[PDB]
Amino acid sequence: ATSASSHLNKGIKQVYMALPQGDKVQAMYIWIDGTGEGLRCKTRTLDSEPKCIEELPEWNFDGSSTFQSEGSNSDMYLVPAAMFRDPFRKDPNKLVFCEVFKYNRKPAETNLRHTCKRIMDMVSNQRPWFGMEQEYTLMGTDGHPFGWPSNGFPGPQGPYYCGVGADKAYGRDIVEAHYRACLYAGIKIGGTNAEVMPAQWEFQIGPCEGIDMGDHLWVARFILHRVCEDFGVIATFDPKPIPGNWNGAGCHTNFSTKAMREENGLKYIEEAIEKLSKRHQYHIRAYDPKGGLDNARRLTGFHETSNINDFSAGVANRGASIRIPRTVGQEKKGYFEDRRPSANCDPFAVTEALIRTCLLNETGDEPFQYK
Amino acid sequence: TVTYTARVAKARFGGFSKLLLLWRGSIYKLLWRELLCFLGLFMALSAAYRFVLTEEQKRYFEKLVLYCDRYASLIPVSFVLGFYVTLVVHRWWNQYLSMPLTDALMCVVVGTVHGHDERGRLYRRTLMRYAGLSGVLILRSVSTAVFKRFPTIDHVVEAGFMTREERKKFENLNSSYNKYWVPCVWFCNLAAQARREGRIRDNGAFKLLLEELNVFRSKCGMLFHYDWISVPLVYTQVVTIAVYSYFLACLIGRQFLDPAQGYKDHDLDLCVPIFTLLQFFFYAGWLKVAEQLINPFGEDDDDFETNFLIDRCFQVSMLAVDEMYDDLAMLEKDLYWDAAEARAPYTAATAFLMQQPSFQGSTFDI
Numbered sequence: 262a263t264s265a266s267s268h269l270n271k272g273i274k275q276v277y278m279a280l281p282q283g284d285k286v287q288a289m290y291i292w293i294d295g296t297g298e299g300l301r302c303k304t305r306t307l308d309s310e311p312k313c314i315e316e317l318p319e320w321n322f323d324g325s326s327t328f329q330s331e332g333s334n335s336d337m338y339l340v341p342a343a344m345f346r347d348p349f350r351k352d353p354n355k356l357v358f359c360e361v362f363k364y365n366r367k368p369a370e371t372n373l374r375h376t377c378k379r380i381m382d383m384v385s386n387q388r389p390w391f392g393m394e395q396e397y398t399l400m401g402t403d404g405h406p407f408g409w410p411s412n413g414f415p416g417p418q419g420p421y422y423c424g425v426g427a428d429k430a431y432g433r434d435i436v437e438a439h440y441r442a443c444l445y446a447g448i449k450i451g452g453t454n455a456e457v458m459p460a461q462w463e464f465q466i467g468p469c470e471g472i473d474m475g476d477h478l479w480v481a482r483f484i485l486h487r488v489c490e491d492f493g494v495i496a497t498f499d500p501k502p503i504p505g506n507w508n509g510a511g512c513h514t515n516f517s518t519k520a521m522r523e524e525n526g527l528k529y530i531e532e533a534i535e536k537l538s539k540r541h542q543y544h545i546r547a548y549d550p551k552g553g554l555d556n557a558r559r560l561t562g563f564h565e566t567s568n569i570n571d572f573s574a575g576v577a578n579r580g581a582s583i584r585i586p587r588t589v590g591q592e593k594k595g596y597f598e599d600r601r602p603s604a605n606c607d608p609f610a611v612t613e614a615l616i617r618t619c620l621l622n623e624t625g626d627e628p629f630q631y632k
Numbered sequence: 633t634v635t636y637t638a639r640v641a642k643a644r645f646g647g648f649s650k651l652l653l654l655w656r657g658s659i660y661k662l663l664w665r666e667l668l669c670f671l672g673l674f675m676a677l678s679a680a681y682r683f684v685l686t687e688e689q690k691r692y693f694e695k696l697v698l699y700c701d702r703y704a705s706l707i708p709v710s711f712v713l714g715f716y717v718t719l720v721v722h723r724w725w726n727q728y729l730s731m732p733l734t735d736a737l738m739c740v741v742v743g744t745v746h747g748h749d750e751r752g753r754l755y756r757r758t759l760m761r762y763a764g765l766s767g768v769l770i771l772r773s774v775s776t777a778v779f780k781r782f783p784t785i786d787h788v789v790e791a792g793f794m795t796r797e798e799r800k801k802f803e804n805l806n807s808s809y810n811k812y813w814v815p816c817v818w819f820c821n822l823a824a825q826a827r828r829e830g831r832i833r834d835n836g837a838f839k840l841l842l843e844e845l846n847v848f849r850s851k852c853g854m855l856f857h858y859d860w861i862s863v864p865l866v867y868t869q870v871v872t873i874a875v876y877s878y879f880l881a882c883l884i885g886r887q888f889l890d891p892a893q894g895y896k897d898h899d900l901d902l903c904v905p906i907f908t909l910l911q912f913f914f915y916a917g918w919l920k921v922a923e924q925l926i927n928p929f930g931e932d933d934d935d936f937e938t939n940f941l942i943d944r945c946f947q948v949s950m951l952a953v954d955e956m957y958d959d960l961a962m963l964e965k966d967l968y969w970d971a972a973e974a975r976a977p978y979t980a981a982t983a984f985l986m987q988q989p990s991f992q993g994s995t996f997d998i
């Protein structure tokens with residue numbers, strides 16, 4: 262069942278969107294709220310099209326309304342971090358992804374980009390590249406997956422993965438609209454597929470260098486939510502939307518450095534993985550917005566997943582925590598895939614943990630300060 | 633410029649003859665100094681021959697006069713003068729046609745850049761002011777009068793052609809070349825912005841504006857080209873040497889010899905070579921035509937009135953795009969709405985010249 266807003270005449274809205282807007286420009290400021298997994302937005306009018314992110318003014322909002330502050334000093338600040346073209350309003354309107362700061366200009370608790378950028382600047386010469394496979398499930402407003410029988414289940418899994426046809430793929434209109442919207446916005450979207458669970462989908466973001474991975478994925482998530490809002494359905498990043506023999510949603514992260522991409526870079530890939538072998542618990546905590554409880558429902562070691570309590574790595578191992586692609590093993594260079602991160606992970610937390618363990622050789626149960 | 637086309641409207645009995653009585657931009661105002669110089673040297677040489685020179689030296693002097701008269705060639709210099717002056721006149725007219733005029737641009741702007749509000753009016757005025765500014769920049773680069781009117785870019789700013797902010801953008805550009813093209817690039821950017829904002833309604837109108845802008849800018853570039861590329865100096869020196877060589881030959885070879893020697897073709901002495909002075913008028917003035925038109929943006933009386941053209945273009949463009957934008961008298965029927973033929977009356981002064989059979993073709997009188 263789709264939302265009441267989706268039943269409003271879309272024809273009418275278009276007619277208003279066809280009006281020439283004139284000299285004023287709309288900027289939509291996007292930020293992460295106090296849950297560390299929700300996105301918030303609002304719009305301001307600018308006098309002219311900004312040429313770069315530097316021209317965008319800082320803004321503010323009430324943190325007590327976003328689970329981000331309490332009491333008197335609840336005013337929070339928005340500092341623009343990345344700019345994109347607005348696919349919902351078209352050029353010259355912009356999407357402005359912002360960092361959140363408290364009233365005293367300290368980073369907000371869900372502001373993970375502030376530290377993530379400092380870590381990325383530390384290893385800039387090694388040029389870390391990331392890719393994330395964002396899985397998501399389309400849901401009706403009733404909390405049941407989009408397209409599934411009322412209070413019931415479709416046929417067993419098997420035909421839905423990369424499926425085509427009215428009985429195989431549910432809500433491809435949303436997937437096509439999102440893909441185009443991301444390409445128009447300047448998001449580094451690498452592809453899409455239908456997932457094993459019907460009404461479950463995936464888009465790939467990358468390759469992205471350093472802090473660009475978190476910006477591109479967060480804005481790609483925002484566009485998906487905004488596109489799904491137009492169609493009147495919900496995109497969930499819950500790691501296990503439906504209990505039982507229905508696939509979880511993960512965010513598989515591909516990681517490579519300049520050394521790993523160069524000839525005979527497999528030795529550096531293996532060195533990074535054995536470093537990851539010794540910090541499995543540290544990464545599980547970082548790979549989930551609430552410390553790894555959500556990913557416990559997904560990482561059961563059954564549905565092409567690994568076990569949350571046990572670390573494993575191998576070439577072409579779908580069930581392992583870390584997978585080296587078969588081609589990467591043959592070519593002796595390229596990347597490795599971390600399959601642990603949950604679909605509702607913060608990419609700033611995930612990328613920072615990979616750099617700290619693999620590149621800065623950090624150890625122990627707490628992140629190093631100033632290094 | 634000296635305009636006399638009213639005087640020569642008809643081929644009258646004294647039409648061109650009375651043009652010799654004019655002074656402003658005339659042959660006399662250009663030549664009288666060289667005329668006095670030539671007469672001074674001729675009279676001094678004649679006086680020296682009559683008095684100072686010995687009787688023995690006078691035979692040598694008169695033989696040298698005959699020798700110099702034999703090589704006085706007036707026909708060949710006419711060819712080099714005709715060809716050189718024709719080239720200079722071609723360049724002069726083409727230079728006039730290259731004046732930055734904004735009439736085409738004002739017509740396109742008033743017909744394509746819309747809005748009765750402050751922003752549409754700002755768009756139209758600024759679009760025409762950019763073309764005016766590029767015209768002012770190229771003209772002050774090429775014309776001495778405009779340069780004395782705008783000795784600095786500060787004078788351009790105080791004149792209202794360029795603003796304070798436009799001045800800062802103008803000076804911050806890193807280029808060692810003349811920046812007369814900058815307001816044209818600003819025009820292109822402003823036209824694109826107007827089209828993006830919906831002030832220009834149709835895609836064709838934007839294309840027409842950029843086509844008319846490139847015509848205006850090419851005229852500015854052509855003025856720069858004519859200013860940079862002179863008539864080749866060697867050819868100017870050739871014509872000057874030919875004319876001056878002929879006149880040096882005429883100064884001595886046409887000297888009045890003593891009739892007592894009885895030399896043929898020299899048995900008279902009028903102490904004034906009036907026919908040589910008429911030939912001086914002819915050839916020296918023919919060279920002076922080129923000497924005045926070679927740079928038509930100077931301060932000669934017949935040079936182009938660049939400041940007047942700047943003032944006219946600015947005032948007319950502002951009027952057309954601001955006060956005349958969408959300001960029309962209501963559509964009404966004319967005097968010939970019901971008339972099969974649309975013909976205006978004639979005054980009493982023109983009827984008796986007119987009312988003649990209309991030309992239909994050469995082959996209809998068979």
Ligand SMILES: [Ca+2]
Nearest residue numbers: 924927930932
């Ligand atoms: Ca002149």
Ligand SMILES: [Cl-]
Nearest residue numbers: 289302303304
């Ligand atoms: Cl909004």
Ligand SMILES: [Mn+2]
Nearest residue numbers: 394396456463
């Ligand atoms: Mn997948």
Ligand SMILES: [Mn+2]
Nearest residue numbers: 394513598600
């Ligand atoms: Mn994968």
